[PDB]
Design an enzyme around this catalytic site. Structure first.
Site, PDB file in Angstrom:
ATOM      1  CD1 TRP A   1      70.204 -24.786 -30.186  1.00 20.87           C
ATOM      2  CD2 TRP A   1      67.916 -25.419 -31.337  1.00 20.87           C
ATOM      3  NE1 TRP A   1      70.226 -24.699 -32.081  1.00 20.87           N
ATOM      4  CE2 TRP A   1      68.927 -24.771 -32.298  1.00 20.87           C
ATOM      5  CE3 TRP A   1      66.836 -25.234 -31.396  1.00 20.87           C
ATOM      6  CZ2 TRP A   1      68.462 -24.267 -33.654  1.00 20.87           C
ATOM      7  CZ3 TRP A   1      65.749 -25.206 -32.623  1.00 20.87           C
ATOM      8  CH2 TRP A   1      67.040 -24.493 -33.749  1.00 20.87           C
TER       9      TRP A   1
ATOM     10  CB  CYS B   1      70.094 -13.137 -29.685  1.00 26.28           C
ATOM     11  SG  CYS B   1      69.675 -15.228 -29.674  1.00 26.28           S
TER      12      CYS B   1
HETATM   13  C1  HEM Z   1      67.415 -21.051 -30.893  1.00 20.38           C
HETATM   14  C2  HEM Z   1      69.083 -21.293 -30.710  1.00 20.38           C
HETATM   15  C3  HEM Z   1      69.441 -19.946 -29.887  1.00 20.38           C
HETATM   16  C4  HEM Z   1      70.769 -19.959 -29.498  1.00 20.38           C
HETATM   17  C5  HEM Z   1      71.470 -20.876 -29.849  1.00 20.38           C
HETATM   18  C6  HEM Z   1      70.373 -19.075 -28.794  1.00 20.38           C
HETATM   19  C7  HEM Z   1      71.310 -18.458 -27.213  1.00 20.38           C
HETATM   20  C8  HEM Z   1      72.039 -17.619 -27.046  1.00 20.38           C
HETATM   21  C9  HEM Z   1      73.046 -17.106 -26.391  1.00 20.38           C
HETATM   22  C10 HEM Z   1      74.458 -18.201 -26.557  1.00 20.38           C
HETATM   23  C11 HEM Z   1      73.119 -16.171 -25.453  1.00 20.38           C
HETATM   24  C12 HEM Z   1      74.297 -15.026 -25.381  1.00 20.38           C
HETATM   25  C13 HEM Z   1      74.184 -15.606 -23.462  1.00 20.38           C
HETATM   26  C14 HEM Z   1      75.617 -16.005 -23.482  1.00 20.38           C
HETATM   27  O1  HEM Z   1      75.652 -16.475 -23.956  1.00 20.38           O
HETATM   28  O2  HEM Z   1      75.685 -15.870 -21.941  1.00 20.38           O
HETATM   29  C15 HEM Z   1      71.479 -15.410 -25.934  1.00 20.38           C
HETATM   30  C16 HEM Z   1      71.255 -14.481 -25.424  1.00 20.38           C
HETATM   31  C17 HEM Z   1      69.731 -14.295 -26.060  1.00 20.38           C
HETATM   32  N1  HEM Z   1      68.432 -14.293 -26.927  1.00 20.38           N
HETATM   33 FE1  HEM Z   1      69.356 -16.961 -27.540  1.00 20.38          FE
HETATM   34  N2  HEM Z   1      69.693 -18.397 -28.319  1.00 20.38           N
HETATM   35  C18 HEM Z   1      68.635 -19.091 -28.678  1.00 20.38           C
HETATM   36  C19 HEM Z   1      67.134 -18.758 -29.224  1.00 20.38           C
HETATM   37  C20 HEM Z   1      66.435 -17.226 -29.371  1.00 20.38           C
HETATM   38  C21 HEM Z   1      64.482 -17.009 -28.747  1.00 20.38           C
HETATM   39  C22 HEM Z   1      63.907 -17.664 -29.482  1.00 20.38           C
HETATM   40  C23 HEM Z   1      65.023 -16.041 -28.267  1.00 20.38           C
HETATM   41  C24 HEM Z   1      63.628 -15.129 -28.185  1.00 20.38           C
HETATM   42  C25 HEM Z   1      62.480 -15.338 -29.241  1.00 20.38           C
HETATM   43  C26 HEM Z   1      66.207 -15.118 -28.087  1.00 20.38           C
HETATM   44  C27 HEM Z   1      66.399 -14.490 -27.256  1.00 20.38           C
HETATM   45  C28 HEM Z   1      67.459 -13.885 -27.118  1.00 20.38           C
HETATM   46  C29 HEM Z   1      67.823 -12.819 -25.854  1.00 20.38           C
HETATM   47  C30 HEM Z   1      66.795 -11.473 -25.746  1.00 20.38           C
HETATM   48  C31 HEM Z   1      68.636 -12.406 -25.716  1.00 20.38           C
HETATM   49  C32 HEM Z   1      69.760 -11.929 -24.616  1.00 20.38           C
HETATM   50  C33 HEM Z   1      69.918 -12.146 -22.946  1.00 20.38           C
HETATM   51  C34 HEM Z   1      69.693 -11.549 -22.310  1.00 20.38           C
HETATM   52  O3  HEM Z   1      70.558  -9.957 -22.595  1.00 20.38           O
HETATM   53  O4  HEM Z   1      70.402 -11.750 -20.752  1.00 20.38           O
HETATM   54  N3  HEM Z   1      66.880 -16.824 -28.510  1.00 20.38           N
HETATM   55  N4  HEM Z   1      70.773 -16.559 -27.102  1.00 20.38           N
HETATM   56  C1  KLD Z   2      66.513 -19.718 -25.768  1.00 18.32           C
HETATM   57  C2  KLD Z   2      67.745 -18.617 -25.233  1.00 18.32           C
HETATM   58  C3  KLD Z   2      69.025 -19.942 -25.555  1.00 18.32           C
HETATM   59  C4  KLD Z   2      70.206 -19.981 -24.985  1.00 18.32           C
HETATM   60  N1  KLD Z   2      70.495 -21.295 -25.482  1.00 18.32           N
HETATM   61  N2  KLD Z   2      70.238 -19.295 -24.171  1.00 18.32           N
HETATM   62  C5  KLD Z   2      69.532 -18.395 -23.544  1.00 18.32           C
HETATM   63  C6  KLD Z   2      70.134 -17.236 -23.059  1.00 18.32           C
HETATM   64  C7  KLD Z   2      70.123 -18.310 -21.499  1.00 18.32           C
HETATM   65  C8  KLD Z   2      71.625 -17.080 -20.938  1.00 18.32           C
HETATM   66  C9  KLD Z   2      72.384 -16.928 -20.667  1.00 18.32           C
HETATM   67  C10 KLD Z   2      73.364 -16.145 -19.639  1.00 18.32           C
HETATM   68  F1  KLD Z   2      74.124 -15.928 -19.572  1.00 18.32           F
HETATM   69  C11 KLD Z   2      72.723 -14.886 -18.543  1.00 18.32           C
HETATM   70  C12 KLD Z   2      71.162 -14.835 -18.563  1.00 18.32           C
HETATM   71  C13 KLD Z   2      70.509 -14.768 -17.449  1.00 18.32           C
HETATM   72  C14 KLD Z   2      71.015 -13.838 -17.364  1.00 18.32           C
HETATM   73  C15 KLD Z   2      71.431 -12.525 -18.194  1.00 18.32           C
HETATM   74  C16 KLD Z   2      72.343 -11.642 -17.327  1.00 18.32           C
HETATM   75  C17 KLD Z   2      71.962 -10.585 -16.131  1.00 18.32           C
HETATM   76  F2  KLD Z   2      71.869 -11.662 -15.124  1.00 18.32           F
HETATM   77  C18 KLD Z   2      70.574 -10.063 -16.898  1.00 18.32           C
HETATM   78  N3  KLD Z   2      70.008 -11.480 -18.311  1.00 18.32           N
HETATM   79  C19 KLD Z   2      69.035 -12.117 -17.498  1.00 18.32           C
HETATM   80  C20 KLD Z   2      70.476 -16.318 -19.734  1.00 18.32           C
HETATM   81  C21 KLD Z   2      68.439 -17.682 -24.162  1.00 18.32           C
END
Ligand code: HEM
Ligand code: KLD
Ligand code: HEM
Ligand code: KLD
Ligand code: H4B
Ligand code: H4B
Ligand code: CL
Ligand code: CL
Ligand code: GD
Ligand code: ZN
Ligand code: ZN
EC number: 1.14.13.39
Lengths: 404, 404
Positions: A280, A108
């Protein structure tokens, strides 16, 4: 203690927090598996182990380690598991744990905000109709007419025997995906499976490319029940470009609320298979990945044709040019709609500040370089030149099997 | 128990069985991943085991494993290591070992070309003066008037008794970097050290931004000696933009030939501290990294301001727009000058073909995702959605300390 260098400035730090990791990752001295999306694959005395550590964390953070309520709260959890084999979190512990799991998420990039998180306690939930109301409260609070606020709703913990609360959708807002004899898909190809479960469970489908799916909410031990989302509650942003007049006519839209609804929250050895969290968007998530991935809406070539770009040679960089303009349209459209969104330059600069903060406070920060670096313009952002260490701390969000 | 590797664009799944033969160990552990670190790493019987593995590899490639010729070579080597502490490669083994080292390089996106490598045997080199002639011939052959050809020149191996041949320069063509009044750097900031060394060793410095450096060449147990490159040997490309006509007035240039000269080549336990190798550029190395990195020529804001972009806010994506046009300029300029260049779309598509060839040939391919994915437009290329496994095979190109 690993040495971590920033190659843009030359500064060096040491990650001492990594020494305190448990749940081992996928890498060995023989080979690094850092790029793998899912690391590998997905007698109750080990519950007490993860609980005593977590409670020590909690009283560490509120300064009151040693004496008083600290070595008092150690006893009832001991007695609760001695009596019942599980234990209940205090509400402030549940709050502290939810914030830490976010703080600990290596993938994140928005973690500068980890301190501002609204935790709705849904542990007295009993039915799927109740879940739905909880989910609807969350969505209303989080959306806030476009002024988004981070929020998590914690449903009842996994229980010895008896089933689990479970949301079958990957997010609270997902667009449908329908096939043909073509094998081609209308709508979102990421959501083809769940779209066919919704229909399998009675959803009369829709016609087009942006149909908000219904929820499948699973109360313990019972089959899923389809819940239709109120259109008033699903804020969406039609996409327009500030100077390409024809862009709006592409009929593109995306929703306001990114709410992940299929990850397991783990606090002090307890498991919450239903704890949907929302924040967001970063604009590259919508513009680059959701709209331009070849296995997603794959709109890149359609935009390039409208921009009259030379799609006949890769060296024109027509893909790069159309992708930037799609991102410009995403940022423009969300701002004009007054829906919170952050561009990848602002986000990554905030994450650098977070790394500096976490260094002072905890001696380092678990970060997954491949996920922190944005999917466009990577080396134009400061995190590209920052070396990072990836490891697993608890509390945590973990992936979990789909209930299929 | 071999790692499963998924491509997310297409849904491909393979297993990297080659990783199980990784004969040296990297920086990751199950506790923590250090995949993003730029520098991950940092007598007779272990020389023998490395030698035997390489000889086995060599006789495998010539479909002669287990033959009399194979075992005589093994017994020859063991005897030579017993009488002299070392051994000599046959010319055919050296050619095969050099190609394998390129094939095995995890950070190289150009490896589809690995079998098409010209190997110059300079192991009879006797002085820094002969070394210079060999290098000039290498530059001439590789440049080939703009139709670039991959090449490597191998100078004598490390051996007990005498010092090493070393090329102090990190590449054969580099631009000088002069510290200045403002405390700033004029020219290429990555090269201030080597620039300061050249001046110490009698070089009369220039004062431009694109001054080509002399070679500091070290014969065994000699101080380094300064050699000027003949200007007609160094092919350069003025940078202009196909439609931004003011771009040519920035005065930007880059050179045709990327020739890395400070890496150590390891073959069968033998070490060649001087073995410069060259190919041709991928355009993002020049446009994104060399010109736009804030710690390099750092031209991004100057270009953006000239393009009349709005540099007051990041949400206008002015950085992304400026960088795209810089890359366009590089590609246009090199094509116009008839100098080989590959864009990041063509190059990553050929790397994907390489992965597929390598899975059939060897059961896998070592690849460093963070280095293979280009620094702009990462997810627009197919390597982004390909999981990769990073590990160390020999023969290999390795980093080594600076000789000073
Ligand atoms: C508040 C602004 C937030 C922004 C801008 C944001 C943005 C992101 C982004 C860009 C990713 C990577 C996924 C991708 O790029 O494809 C991510 C992953 C993640 N975020 Fe954040 N997020 C936010 C809030 C949160 C909150 C509130 C939580 C939990 C309480 C959280 C938990 C996670 C987790 C667990 C992942 C890993 C997702 C995965 O492994 O698939 N995020 N977030
Ligand atoms: C709170 C919040 C805010 C924000 N702005 N973004 C996020 C993450 C959004 C996201 C990005 C992504 F690239 C892939 C997955 C889902 C799939 C991933 C990849 C694999 F399938 C297992 N995971 C679950 C979800 C969360
Ligand atoms: C022929 C065309 C070639 C292309 C297009 C190419 C491309 C690249 C690129 C883009 C990188 C990473 C640079 C970056 O940061 O952007 C790289 C690294 C590397 N290349 Fe290739 N290369 C080519 C030829 C060669 C040859 C001929 C050799 C050796 C015989 C070689 C060996 C390596 C090695 C060892 C690295 C890693 C360098 C390091 O770890 O710092 N390459 N290459
Ligand atoms: C033959 C060839 C062809 C081609 N087209 N490209 C290349 C890559 C050129 C290169 C790129 C890079 F990104 C870093 C380094 C050296 C520095 C690295 C990083 C750190 F400074 C220490 N290492 C030694 C060198 C080589
Ligand atoms: C810290 C970070 O790993 C470092 O800046 C790396 C990232 N990936 C890279 N990839 C390539 N091809 N070249 C580089 O110089 C880098 N730099
Ligand atoms: C194969 C590769 O590891 C995979 O496609 C990852 C790479 N990095 C990513 N980074 C983010 N933020 N989101 C993703 O889905 C991915 N995909
Ligand atoms: Cl999403
Ligand atoms: Cl370079
Ligand atoms: Gd013009
Ligand atoms: Zn790793
Ligand atoms: Zn850079």
């Amino acid at each position: 203690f690993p040495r971590v260098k920033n190659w843009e400035v030359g500064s060096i730090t040491y990650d001492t927090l990594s020494a305190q990791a448990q749940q081992d990752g996928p890498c060995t001295p023989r080979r690094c598996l850092g790029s793998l999306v899912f690391p590998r694959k997905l007698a109750p005395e080990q519950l007490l182990s993860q609980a005593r550590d977590f409670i020590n964390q909690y009283y560490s953070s509120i300064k009151r380690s040693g004496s008083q309520a600290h070595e008092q709260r150690l006893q009832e959890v001991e007695a609760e598991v001695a009596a019942t084999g599980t234990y209940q979190l205090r509400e402030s512990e549940l709050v502290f744990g939810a914030k830490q799991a976010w703080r600990n998420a290596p993938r994140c990039v928005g973690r500068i905000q980890w301190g501002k998180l609204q935790v709705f306690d849904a542990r007295d939930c009993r039915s799927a109709q109740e879940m739905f109301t909880y989910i609807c409260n969350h969505i209303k609070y989080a959306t806030n007419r476009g002024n988004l606020r981070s929020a998590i709703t914690v449903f009842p913990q996994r229980c010895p025997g008896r089933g689990d609360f479970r949301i079958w959708n990957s997010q609270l807002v997902r667009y449908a995906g329908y096939r043909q004899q073509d094998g081609s898909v209308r709508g979102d190809p990421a959501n083809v499976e769940i779209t066919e479960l919704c229909i399998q469970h009675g959803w009369t489908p829709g016609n087009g490319r942006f149909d908000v799916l219904p929820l499948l909410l699973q109360a313990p031990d019972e089959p899923p029940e389809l819940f239709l989302l109120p259109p008033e509650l699903v804020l969406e942003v039609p996409l327009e470009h500030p100077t390409l007049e024809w862009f709006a006519a592409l009929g593109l839209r995306w929703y306001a609320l990114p709410a992940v609804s299929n990850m397991l929250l783990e606090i002090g050895g307890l498991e919450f298979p239903a704890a949907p969290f929302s924040g967001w968007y970063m604009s590259t998530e919508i513009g680059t990945r959701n709209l331009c991935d070849p296995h997603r809406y794959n709109i890149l070539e359609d935009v390039a044709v409208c921009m009259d770009l030379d799609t006949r040679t890769t060296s024109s960089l027509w893909k790069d040019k159309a992708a930037v303009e799609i991102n410009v349209a995403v940022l423009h459209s969300y701002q004009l709609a007054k829906v919170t969104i952050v561009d990848h330059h602002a986000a990554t600069a905030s994450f650098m500040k977070h790394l500096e903060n976490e260094q002072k406070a905890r001696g380092g920060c678990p970060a997954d370089w491949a996920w922190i670096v944005p999917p466009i313009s990577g080396s134009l952002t400061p995190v590209f030149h920052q070396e990072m260490v990836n490891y697993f701390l608890s509390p945590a969000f973990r992936y979990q099997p789909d209930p299929w």
